[PDB]
Amino acid sequence: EQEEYKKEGIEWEFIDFGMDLAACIELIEKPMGIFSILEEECMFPKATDTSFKNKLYDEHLGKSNNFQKPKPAKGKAEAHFSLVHYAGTVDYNISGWL
Amino acid sequence: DEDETTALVCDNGSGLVKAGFAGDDAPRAVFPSIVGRPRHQGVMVGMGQKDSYVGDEAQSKRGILTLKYPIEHGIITNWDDMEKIWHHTFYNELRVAPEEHPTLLTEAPLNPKANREKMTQIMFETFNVPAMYVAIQAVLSLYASGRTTGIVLDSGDGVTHNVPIYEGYALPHAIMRLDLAGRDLTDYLMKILTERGYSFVTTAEREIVRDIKEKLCYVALDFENEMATAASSSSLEKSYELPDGQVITIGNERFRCPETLFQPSFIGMESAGIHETTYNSIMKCDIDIRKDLYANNVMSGGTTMYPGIADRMQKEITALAPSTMKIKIIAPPERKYSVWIGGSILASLSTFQQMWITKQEYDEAGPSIVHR
Amino acid sequence: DEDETTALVCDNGSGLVKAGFAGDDAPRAVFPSIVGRPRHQGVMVGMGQKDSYVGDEAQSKRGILTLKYPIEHGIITNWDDMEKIWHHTFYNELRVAPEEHPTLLTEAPLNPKANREKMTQIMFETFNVPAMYVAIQAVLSLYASGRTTGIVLDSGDGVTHNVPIYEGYALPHAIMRLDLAGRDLTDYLMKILTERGYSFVTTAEREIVRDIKEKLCYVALDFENEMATAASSSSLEKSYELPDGQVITIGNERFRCPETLFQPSFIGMESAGIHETTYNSIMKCDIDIRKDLYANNVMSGGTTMYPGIADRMQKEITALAPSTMKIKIIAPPERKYSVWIGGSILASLSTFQQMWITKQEYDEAGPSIVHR
């Protein structure tokens, strides 16, 4: 986009459109994010899906915006955690993950 | 992979270092925790003058060097000589460059705050590692046996400990330390074996008493009517062949050596013994957590490897614990590396990445950052 | 049979729940009124993670949970935790499905209008019972002793009450509540027994002081020349053997504990005591009904079980009442379940069917319907 306004000579300033999504990505891929908590617990010989779950919350819940506790009803089957992806809210079930 | 391959795990002991890559099943490197300093000027053929020697070259050449142990009773006592053992570990033993490897280290049970900050100062400021982490030893042993609550009896070369852990937090006020371990135990065998009418005269006689202790020693259950058994003289005896022919026989003393761990009185120690101490740790903890600790006595350390240690401990604490209780003494086979394996698991784990102390954290927060 | 078999009776207390089927002679289920919440993350062997614990599993596992009492002084204080105790009662203790059983519940003497409406809201809207009914506790106790006019001294774990009842209607303005009961009484024994030179140190020492109170405690008549008797030291003493051998002796304190119910001053209470309060309730009632109440002092509740409670009360109120009066202190043997038994009778009764609040009444009238 920015090339055009540069080619033409228009005066339009704008922030990267990607940026809007960085929030969600960090939450997943960053160090204290989902995957990590997921892959750490996998090291605990006596961890539970339930265990994992709590770790997920204690650390992201209330502190993270893209992080949310599910909406259990509608066409959904159970509760664990929703995320706020660009496309929308996804209700995730954590069972078997470990 | 960046660091999946790349995480190092170094377990610093009083007698041995255990080291290797997070991911492996066992330590890539195991070697004595010594630093030898030559008593005289001179050289080996083909080498240059060496100021210092570490690990096995210090042990092998001990006759011309003054040997020193950096870790007294699990705590680092000399920081000049420890930085020497670390240097050796990275550069010669694992042959890695440290400045591109995250390093998980271990410390002892009530390791002084200031030390955890000092080895962090040396890891980041003289070795320039990307990130590091210090785990408590009993805590890695427990975790390597799958669980998160239990009490670890940990026993190696210079210290024994009891570290009650609840949902991962080691309980400071219930931890017990008993300064009698495998080192003390080799020297006691030594005397009951010279006392059997023998002589460990040259250094090739000294060293192998320790290999007798490891191979032939036992912890008998009913150590009472085992001495009684010794006397009727059954085929309980056991002869070991020395570096040469000199077949030495050890019948009885074979178990008189680990009976030292239950009776410190065998060695002029007035302290209580392993089983009582397991127990006392436990009646120092909260009441509601005592059924948990009792069903999860995890054992780790080289000196807890004596066969029948677990059965004796099983019966030692059943008979001190209220009968309403379930006793359970877990002693895995790899226990001489539990600590290390627990670190390998943890550091290769998917969720641990967010607890690594990075140079960013350090250059910005001071050694305080990792100290917790 | 549809509901002859099918009526449930649940008596919610400050210390214990009593539950069972209308028809039975005694509660099928009796258990502490606690809800435990685990202080740490972890599991028992073979079970999953449990968010909550109720009754005896909360008591037994108290060391790792934060215990909470839903009913403070007979009134439901936490409705999240009460719905938890009810759930446990139906589904685990009595193992019934509630949606096909009429449920008779009990409430306390001056239970706030809004609560009787709230437990109705929870009975019908979250448990979906067919029909229910809330009886006042003293009123079921009286009725279980056959009569309809009398005054009940009711005393359990957190509250004591006096509820004057006339032809079935409990008299609001004459009811007295004294917040000192069996809970307060176990803690006072505790101190007069440590004060006898003892130690209830571990939790297995704490719990059994309560079993000492129940088994060996007495309410002496002429508590005056009973202390005097203690001193001459007769064979009045009584030794109890602890979980182990540790034979503890209790001679005297044995009755110093229930003398607390007549003298609240023993415990820094400035309130009047049981007998005076029986009386004051009575000189707060109509004049013409006072001969009735005096000849019908019905006792109910765990704390009124101390032997010789009735004789002391007998003489306590004779000597305060006008001599033209007949005093009569009824104390039945099953009194720790009077309340429950009165509910069992009433709810299994042939004429009670027409007072059950049905979901028809509720869905049509709102919680107001049962509130009366």
Short mmCIF file of N, CA and C in Angstrom, two decimals, chain C residues 235-359:
data_model
loop_
_atom_site.label_atom_id
_atom_site.label_comp_id
_atom_site.label_asym_id
_atom_site.label_seq_id
_atom_site.Cartn_x
_atom_site.Cartn_y
_atom_site.Cartn_z
N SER C 235 -13.17 -41.71 94.29
CA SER C 235 -13.02 -42.43 93.05
C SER C 235 -14.00 -41.78 92.05
N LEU C 236 -13.89 -40.42 91.91
CA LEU C 236 -14.65 -39.61 90.97
C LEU C 236 -13.85 -39.50 89.65
N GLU C 237 -12.50 -39.56 89.72
CA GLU C 237 -11.58 -39.50 88.57
C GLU C 237 -11.86 -40.45 87.39
N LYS C 238 -11.43 -40.09 86.17
CA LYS C 238 -11.66 -40.97 85.04
C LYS C 238 -10.61 -40.87 83.95
N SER C 239 -9.84 -41.95 83.82
CA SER C 239 -8.82 -42.03 82.78
C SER C 239 -9.25 -42.72 81.50
N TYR C 240 -8.95 -41.99 80.42
CA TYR C 240 -9.24 -42.34 79.04
C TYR C 240 -7.92 -42.74 78.37
N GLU C 241 -7.86 -43.83 77.59
CA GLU C 241 -6.64 -44.19 76.84
C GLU C 241 -6.67 -43.58 75.44
N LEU C 242 -5.63 -42.78 75.14
CA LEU C 242 -5.53 -42.02 73.89
C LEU C 242 -5.41 -42.84 72.58
N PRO C 243 -5.14 -42.38 71.31
CA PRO C 243 -5.03 -43.25 70.11
C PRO C 243 -4.02 -44.40 70.31
N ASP C 244 -2.98 -44.04 71.09
CA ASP C 244 -1.93 -44.91 71.62
C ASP C 244 -2.17 -45.21 73.13
N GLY C 245 -1.13 -45.64 73.89
CA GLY C 245 -1.21 -45.98 75.31
C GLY C 245 -1.54 -44.82 76.23
N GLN C 246 -0.78 -43.72 76.07
CA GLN C 246 -0.91 -42.45 76.80
C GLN C 246 -2.23 -42.15 77.53
N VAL C 247 -2.35 -42.89 78.63
CA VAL C 247 -3.53 -42.79 79.48
C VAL C 247 -3.59 -41.45 80.19
N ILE C 248 -4.57 -40.71 79.71
CA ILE C 248 -4.81 -39.40 80.26
C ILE C 248 -5.88 -39.50 81.36
N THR C 249 -5.72 -38.77 82.47
CA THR C 249 -6.73 -38.77 83.53
C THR C 249 -7.44 -37.41 83.64
N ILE C 250 -8.75 -37.56 83.86
CA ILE C 250 -9.69 -36.46 83.95
C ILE C 250 -10.55 -36.86 85.12
N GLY C 251 -10.39 -36.12 86.19
CA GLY C 251 -11.21 -36.41 87.33
C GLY C 251 -12.40 -35.50 87.37
N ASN C 252 -11.93 -34.31 87.71
CA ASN C 252 -12.69 -33.14 88.09
C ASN C 252 -13.29 -32.37 86.88
N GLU C 253 -12.48 -31.76 85.98
CA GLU C 253 -12.87 -31.03 84.75
C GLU C 253 -13.99 -31.57 83.86
N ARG C 254 -14.08 -32.88 84.01
CA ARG C 254 -15.17 -33.70 83.55
C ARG C 254 -16.57 -33.00 83.62
N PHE C 255 -16.85 -32.25 84.72
CA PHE C 255 -18.09 -31.51 84.92
C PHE C 255 -17.88 -29.99 84.89
N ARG C 256 -16.64 -29.52 84.95
CA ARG C 256 -16.35 -28.10 84.87
C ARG C 256 -16.69 -27.58 83.47
N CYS C 257 -16.68 -28.50 82.50
CA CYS C 257 -17.01 -28.20 81.10
C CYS C 257 -18.53 -27.94 80.94
N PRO C 258 -19.52 -28.79 81.27
CA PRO C 258 -20.93 -28.46 81.16
C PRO C 258 -21.36 -27.40 82.21
N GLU C 259 -20.69 -27.17 83.38
CA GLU C 259 -21.01 -26.05 84.28
C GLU C 259 -20.83 -24.79 83.39
N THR C 260 -20.15 -24.80 82.22
CA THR C 260 -20.05 -23.62 81.38
C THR C 260 -21.43 -23.25 80.86
N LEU C 261 -22.26 -24.22 80.48
CA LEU C 261 -23.63 -23.92 80.06
C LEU C 261 -24.51 -23.17 81.09
N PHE C 262 -24.27 -23.27 82.42
CA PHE C 262 -25.01 -22.52 83.44
C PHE C 262 -24.29 -21.24 83.84
N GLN C 263 -22.96 -21.27 83.71
CA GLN C 263 -22.09 -20.14 83.99
C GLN C 263 -21.27 -19.85 82.73
N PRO C 264 -21.69 -18.89 81.88
CA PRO C 264 -21.00 -18.47 80.67
C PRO C 264 -19.75 -17.69 81.05
N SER C 265 -19.71 -17.21 82.32
CA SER C 265 -18.57 -16.49 82.93
C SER C 265 -17.24 -17.28 82.99
N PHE C 266 -17.36 -18.63 82.89
CA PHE C 266 -16.25 -19.57 82.77
C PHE C 266 -15.49 -19.36 81.48
N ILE C 267 -16.16 -18.72 80.53
CA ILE C 267 -15.57 -18.50 79.24
C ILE C 267 -15.63 -17.05 78.78
N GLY C 268 -15.62 -16.11 79.72
CA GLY C 268 -15.62 -14.72 79.32
C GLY C 268 -16.88 -14.31 78.57
N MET C 269 -17.95 -15.09 78.80
CA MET C 269 -19.24 -14.66 78.30
C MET C 269 -20.00 -13.96 79.41
N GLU C 270 -20.54 -12.79 79.05
CA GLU C 270 -21.38 -11.97 79.94
C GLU C 270 -22.89 -12.24 79.87
N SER C 271 -23.32 -13.03 78.88
CA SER C 271 -24.70 -13.47 78.70
C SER C 271 -25.14 -14.32 79.87
N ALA C 272 -26.47 -14.42 80.00
CA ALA C 272 -27.08 -15.27 81.02
C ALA C 272 -26.96 -16.76 80.64
N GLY C 273 -27.28 -17.71 81.51
CA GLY C 273 -27.11 -19.11 81.16
C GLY C 273 -28.41 -19.84 80.91
N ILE C 274 -28.30 -21.00 80.22
CA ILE C 274 -29.38 -21.91 79.87
C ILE C 274 -30.67 -21.88 80.71
N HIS C 275 -30.57 -22.03 82.04
CA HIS C 275 -31.71 -22.09 82.94
C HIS C 275 -32.42 -20.77 83.16
N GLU C 276 -31.64 -19.70 83.23
CA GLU C 276 -32.18 -18.38 83.39
C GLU C 276 -32.84 -18.01 82.13
N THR C 277 -32.26 -18.43 81.02
CA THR C 277 -32.77 -18.09 79.72
C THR C 277 -34.05 -18.86 79.48
N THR C 278 -34.19 -20.12 79.90
CA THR C 278 -35.44 -20.89 79.82
C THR C 278 -36.59 -20.10 80.46
N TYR C 279 -36.21 -19.59 81.63
CA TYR C 279 -37.08 -18.83 82.46
C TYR C 279 -37.39 -17.53 81.81
N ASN C 280 -36.43 -16.77 81.31
CA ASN C 280 -36.75 -15.45 80.82
C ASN C 280 -37.67 -15.50 79.62
N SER C 281 -37.53 -16.57 78.82
CA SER C 281 -38.34 -16.82 77.63
C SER C 281 -39.77 -16.89 78.11
N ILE C 282 -39.88 -17.63 79.22
CA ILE C 282 -41.15 -17.92 79.86
C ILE C 282 -41.70 -16.65 80.47
N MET C 283 -41.01 -15.78 81.22
CA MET C 283 -41.71 -14.58 81.67
C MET C 283 -41.87 -13.49 80.58
N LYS C 284 -41.56 -13.83 79.30
CA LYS C 284 -41.82 -13.01 78.10
C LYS C 284 -43.06 -13.43 77.32
N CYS C 285 -43.66 -14.55 77.73
CA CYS C 285 -44.84 -15.13 77.10
C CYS C 285 -46.12 -14.74 77.78
N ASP C 286 -47.28 -15.02 77.19
CA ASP C 286 -48.54 -14.74 77.86
C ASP C 286 -48.56 -15.60 79.11
N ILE C 287 -49.20 -14.95 80.09
CA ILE C 287 -49.45 -15.38 81.49
C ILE C 287 -50.22 -16.70 81.71
N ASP C 288 -51.29 -16.79 80.91
CA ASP C 288 -52.15 -17.93 80.91
C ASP C 288 -51.38 -19.11 80.30
N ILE C 289 -50.37 -18.92 79.41
CA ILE C 289 -49.68 -20.08 78.83
C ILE C 289 -48.48 -20.49 79.64
N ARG C 290 -48.03 -19.69 80.61
CA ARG C 290 -46.87 -20.06 81.38
C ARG C 290 -47.08 -21.35 82.18
N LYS C 291 -48.24 -21.86 82.65
CA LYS C 291 -48.16 -23.16 83.34
C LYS C 291 -47.80 -24.29 82.37
N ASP C 292 -48.19 -24.12 81.08
CA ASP C 292 -48.00 -25.12 80.05
C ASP C 292 -46.53 -25.27 79.70
N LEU C 293 -45.90 -24.16 79.35
CA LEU C 293 -44.50 -24.14 79.08
C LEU C 293 -43.69 -24.74 80.23
N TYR C 294 -44.05 -24.44 81.49
CA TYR C 294 -43.29 -24.97 82.60
C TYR C 294 -43.37 -26.46 82.77
N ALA C 295 -44.48 -27.06 82.42
CA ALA C 295 -44.55 -28.50 82.57
C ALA C 295 -44.08 -29.20 81.29
N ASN C 296 -43.47 -28.46 80.35
CA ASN C 296 -43.07 -29.04 79.09
C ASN C 296 -41.84 -28.42 78.50
N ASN C 297 -40.75 -28.60 79.23
CA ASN C 297 -39.44 -28.14 78.83
C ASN C 297 -38.84 -29.32 78.10
N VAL C 298 -38.86 -29.30 76.80
CA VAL C 298 -38.37 -30.41 76.03
C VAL C 298 -36.97 -29.98 75.66
N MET C 299 -36.07 -30.95 75.82
CA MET C 299 -34.70 -30.73 75.43
C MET C 299 -34.32 -31.45 74.14
N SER C 300 -33.60 -30.76 73.27
CA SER C 300 -33.06 -31.45 72.13
C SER C 300 -31.71 -30.87 71.76
N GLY C 301 -30.91 -31.68 71.05
CA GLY C 301 -29.60 -31.25 70.59
C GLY C 301 -28.42 -32.01 71.21
N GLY C 302 -27.35 -32.18 70.42
CA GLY C 302 -26.18 -32.91 70.86
C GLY C 302 -25.64 -32.41 72.19
N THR C 303 -25.57 -31.10 72.42
CA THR C 303 -24.99 -30.60 73.64
C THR C 303 -25.91 -30.77 74.83
N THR C 304 -27.18 -31.18 74.71
CA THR C 304 -28.04 -31.38 75.90
C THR C 304 -27.99 -32.83 76.37
N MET C 305 -27.05 -33.60 75.81
CA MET C 305 -26.92 -35.02 76.11
C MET C 305 -26.06 -35.31 77.33
N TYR C 306 -25.25 -34.34 77.83
CA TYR C 306 -24.42 -34.49 79.03
C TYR C 306 -25.26 -35.09 80.15
N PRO C 307 -25.07 -36.30 80.70
CA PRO C 307 -25.90 -36.82 81.79
C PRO C 307 -26.09 -35.82 82.96
N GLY C 308 -27.30 -35.84 83.56
CA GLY C 308 -27.62 -35.01 84.71
C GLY C 308 -27.90 -33.56 84.40
N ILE C 309 -28.16 -33.34 83.11
CA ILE C 309 -28.46 -32.02 82.56
C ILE C 309 -29.87 -31.62 82.91
N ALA C 310 -30.70 -32.67 82.86
CA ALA C 310 -32.12 -32.57 83.11
C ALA C 310 -32.32 -32.32 84.60
N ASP C 311 -31.67 -33.07 85.54
CA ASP C 311 -31.81 -32.88 86.99
C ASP C 311 -31.37 -31.48 87.42
N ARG C 312 -30.22 -31.01 86.91
CA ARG C 312 -29.74 -29.67 87.18
C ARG C 312 -30.79 -28.70 86.66
N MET C 313 -31.34 -28.85 85.44
CA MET C 313 -32.32 -27.90 84.91
C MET C 313 -33.64 -27.89 85.65
N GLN C 314 -33.98 -29.08 86.17
CA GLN C 314 -35.16 -29.37 86.95
C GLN C 314 -35.18 -28.51 88.18
N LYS C 315 -34.05 -28.59 88.88
CA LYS C 315 -33.85 -27.82 90.08
C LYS C 315 -33.47 -26.38 89.83
N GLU C 316 -32.95 -26.12 88.64
CA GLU C 316 -32.59 -24.76 88.35
C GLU C 316 -33.84 -23.92 88.13
N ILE C 317 -34.83 -24.45 87.40
CA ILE C 317 -36.00 -23.63 87.20
C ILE C 317 -37.03 -23.82 88.30
N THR C 318 -37.12 -24.91 89.07
CA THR C 318 -38.07 -25.00 90.18
C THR C 318 -37.85 -23.83 91.13
N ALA C 319 -36.57 -23.67 91.45
CA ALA C 319 -36.13 -22.61 92.32
C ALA C 319 -36.12 -21.19 91.72
N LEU C 320 -36.68 -20.97 90.52
CA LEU C 320 -36.86 -19.62 89.99
C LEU C 320 -38.33 -19.35 89.69
N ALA C 321 -39.05 -20.46 89.49
CA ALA C 321 -40.47 -20.45 89.20
C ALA C 321 -41.34 -20.32 90.45
N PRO C 322 -42.54 -19.69 90.40
CA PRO C 322 -43.44 -19.52 91.55
C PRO C 322 -43.83 -20.90 92.11
N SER C 323 -43.75 -21.25 93.40
CA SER C 323 -44.04 -22.62 93.90
C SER C 323 -45.36 -23.32 93.58
N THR C 324 -46.31 -22.49 93.16
CA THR C 324 -47.62 -22.92 92.71
C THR C 324 -47.51 -23.68 91.37
N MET C 325 -46.31 -23.69 90.78
CA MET C 325 -46.08 -24.22 89.47
C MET C 325 -45.51 -25.62 89.46
N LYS C 326 -45.89 -26.29 88.39
CA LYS C 326 -45.35 -27.60 88.10
C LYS C 326 -44.26 -27.40 87.04
N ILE C 327 -43.07 -27.90 87.38
CA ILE C 327 -41.91 -27.86 86.50
C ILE C 327 -41.86 -29.24 85.84
N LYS C 328 -41.43 -29.39 84.58
CA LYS C 328 -41.20 -30.72 84.01
C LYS C 328 -40.29 -30.65 82.80
N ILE C 329 -39.08 -31.20 83.03
CA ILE C 329 -37.98 -31.22 82.06
C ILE C 329 -37.90 -32.56 81.34
N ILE C 330 -38.44 -32.62 80.12
CA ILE C 330 -38.40 -33.81 79.30
C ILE C 330 -37.10 -33.73 78.48
N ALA C 331 -36.32 -34.82 78.60
CA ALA C 331 -35.07 -35.03 77.89
C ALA C 331 -35.08 -36.46 77.37
N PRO C 332 -35.54 -36.78 76.16
CA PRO C 332 -35.54 -38.14 75.64
C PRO C 332 -34.13 -38.62 75.28
N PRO C 333 -33.93 -39.94 75.15
CA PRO C 333 -32.65 -40.55 74.83
C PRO C 333 -32.20 -40.29 73.41
N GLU C 334 -33.12 -40.29 72.45
CA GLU C 334 -32.69 -40.07 71.10
C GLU C 334 -32.48 -38.58 70.88
N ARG C 335 -32.57 -37.67 71.86
CA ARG C 335 -32.46 -36.23 71.62
C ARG C 335 -31.42 -35.61 70.67
N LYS C 336 -30.27 -36.24 70.44
CA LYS C 336 -29.35 -35.74 69.42
C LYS C 336 -30.00 -35.83 68.03
N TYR C 337 -31.08 -36.58 67.77
CA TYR C 337 -31.83 -36.56 66.52
C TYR C 337 -33.33 -36.16 66.69
N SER C 338 -33.79 -35.48 67.76
CA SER C 338 -35.21 -35.13 67.94
C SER C 338 -35.82 -34.43 66.76
N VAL C 339 -35.10 -33.37 66.38
CA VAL C 339 -35.40 -32.55 65.23
C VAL C 339 -35.67 -33.43 64.04
N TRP C 340 -34.75 -34.37 63.74
CA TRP C 340 -34.84 -35.16 62.53
C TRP C 340 -36.03 -36.12 62.59
N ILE C 341 -36.22 -36.70 63.78
CA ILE C 341 -37.20 -37.73 63.98
C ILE C 341 -38.55 -37.07 63.86
N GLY C 342 -38.70 -35.84 64.38
CA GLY C 342 -39.95 -35.07 64.30
C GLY C 342 -40.30 -34.81 62.85
N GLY C 343 -39.29 -34.65 61.99
CA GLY C 343 -39.48 -34.43 60.59
C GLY C 343 -39.88 -35.72 59.90
N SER C 344 -39.27 -36.85 60.29
CA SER C 344 -39.56 -38.15 59.74
C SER C 344 -41.01 -38.56 59.96
N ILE C 345 -41.47 -38.26 61.18
CA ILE C 345 -42.83 -38.56 61.59
C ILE C 345 -43.78 -37.73 60.75
N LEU C 346 -43.62 -36.42 60.87
CA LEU C 346 -44.44 -35.45 60.21
C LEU C 346 -44.51 -35.69 58.71
N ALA C 347 -43.36 -35.91 58.07
CA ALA C 347 -43.36 -36.02 56.62
C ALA C 347 -43.88 -37.36 56.17
N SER C 348 -43.83 -38.39 57.01
CA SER C 348 -44.40 -39.67 56.58
C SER C 348 -45.91 -39.72 56.87
N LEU C 349 -46.36 -38.79 57.71
CA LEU C 349 -47.77 -38.64 58.05
C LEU C 349 -48.71 -38.42 56.88
N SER C 350 -49.79 -39.11 57.20
CA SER C 350 -51.03 -39.21 56.45
C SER C 350 -51.61 -37.82 56.18
N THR C 351 -51.54 -36.85 57.09
CA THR C 351 -52.12 -35.54 56.84
C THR C 351 -51.24 -34.44 56.28
N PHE C 352 -49.97 -34.76 56.09
CA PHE C 352 -49.00 -33.74 55.70
C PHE C 352 -48.95 -33.45 54.21
N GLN C 353 -49.54 -34.40 53.50
CA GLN C 353 -49.50 -34.37 52.07
C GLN C 353 -50.03 -33.06 51.53
N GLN C 354 -51.11 -32.57 52.12
CA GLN C 354 -51.67 -31.29 51.72
C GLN C 354 -50.88 -30.05 52.15
N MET C 355 -49.74 -30.13 52.88
CA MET C 355 -48.88 -28.95 53.08
C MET C 355 -47.58 -28.94 52.24
N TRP C 356 -47.22 -30.03 51.55
CA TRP C 356 -46.07 -30.03 50.65
C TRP C 356 -46.06 -28.91 49.61
N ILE C 357 -45.08 -27.99 49.48
CA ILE C 357 -45.10 -27.01 48.38
C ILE C 357 -44.68 -27.69 47.08
N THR C 358 -45.59 -27.78 46.09
CA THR C 358 -45.26 -28.48 44.85
C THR C 358 -44.72 -27.51 43.82
N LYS C 359 -43.94 -28.00 42.84
CA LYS C 359 -43.51 -27.19 41.71
C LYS C 359 -44.65 -26.44 41.03
#
